Amino acid sequence: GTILIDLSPDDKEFQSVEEEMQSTVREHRDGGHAGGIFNRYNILKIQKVCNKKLWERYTHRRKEVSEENHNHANERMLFHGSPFVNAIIHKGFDERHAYIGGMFGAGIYFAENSSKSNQYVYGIGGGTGCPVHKDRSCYICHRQLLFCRVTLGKSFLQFSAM
Template sequence: MTETCLNFFPHHWKPSICRDCTKMKDEHVIVHIPEIIDKSSSEILSSSRQTTNDNHRNHTIIVSQHESDHRLDIDTHLLDDKKKKPISKSTDKLKRKKKRDQRKDDEYRFIELVAKQVQELIIQLDLKNEEIKKLRLDQTKMVRYHETLEKALVDELEYRERRELERQHILTIPRRTPSYWGSNAFSESYREILISNQSKEFDIINSLVNSTISKHGNRYGTINGQDPTAFVVKQIRRIQNIRLWHEYCYQKDSIINKNNDQIDDCGSSIYLEVNPILMPLLDKNANEYWLFHGCDQTHISDLLQIGYDPRISNSLGIFGGGFYLAENSSKSNQYIPCPGCGGNNRF
């Protein structure tokens, strides 16, 4: 039979049970022995010797011994509790710290993940902004291109309309050739007609050449170092070039329209006034002149086939580059070789 404790000490986990004898609190006889507990073992022993009853002495000793052992056991349990509690608190603190650190790490990882996602969104947004900017630039270029294309189309339509009007106007321009050219003047696109020295046309040109001689007082255009007093016309060729003739008619009509058909009021050439014989071959409405041009024989063919082109003219002329013409036959004679050096050419 288990001996009952003299005092009840509740268990830490089960307060209704004694931790020493594992009995309920009701089964304990509580004995108050503060003096025994407080006194030292030597005092307990001395009091036991004075007792005459052996049984009582033994009981006292047993009780005292039990109480002493119980006291030691209490102290041992208290020490164990004191030792256990700091360990438990330290463990809990470490666990809590570990949890806090874990939460911090999780929060840091979450923040890093969010920051990474935000950075990716920013990059995507920048790419979209660049794409939008490029699209806007392409749109601007496309708008400008369409504007340029539309303007070019309008210009082209206006040009075609203008050309059509010019063509219609050109069709109305009189292209009739002089009567002395004959009825089959343009049977070929280019013809050279040798003028008979017995014709009226030959006489007019011969008179024109010799009536426009002037004194120039220099070695250029002279014959044997002297100014010519007359030219002997040996041969005259009339050039019938259909392309050049149409261009000439168009330019002549433009001049007439530009001056409101009043060009005949302008002063005519002095040579035409002095020599009315030159007039029959000219158009009075356009105030036409007879002009001369002197050049080297090597350029004659190009002039007859293509016409005058001031872009390839000599830039050393008195008035700079250009195509020079003169009313004086002797002036044009200055630009052709001397007959003694290779013959004359005059156009």
């Protein structure tokens, strides 16, 4: 089902996605414990994820949400870091990906800060870091994040203490 199209670094679309990654790095209150110590990334590859079934599933729900929220899907582009990236691009998000321990209940979490999502690529709290070196701040091993299209609809505003 899923096809991955490599984007050229000379393409405006690649440069735009990279800029969103780089410009949303921030410092984290754990000093880098979960995700590592860095101010920027080395972008190695950006692939467009193509899946007709998943896309039509997404746009079908988007239209339902839009009609329940004064014709406004409230669609965002947001980061998601997860060990389950390979399952997500082939089968989509589902209830197995619900973060029971999340601060806003058992759902699927996304971040505006790329570096927030980077804290979860190796698991909750960075897990034990990369599989080869067990290093949550590994500078060697390749990581993967998703940049996702997300329908928020009417979003409940929850101020957090973070």
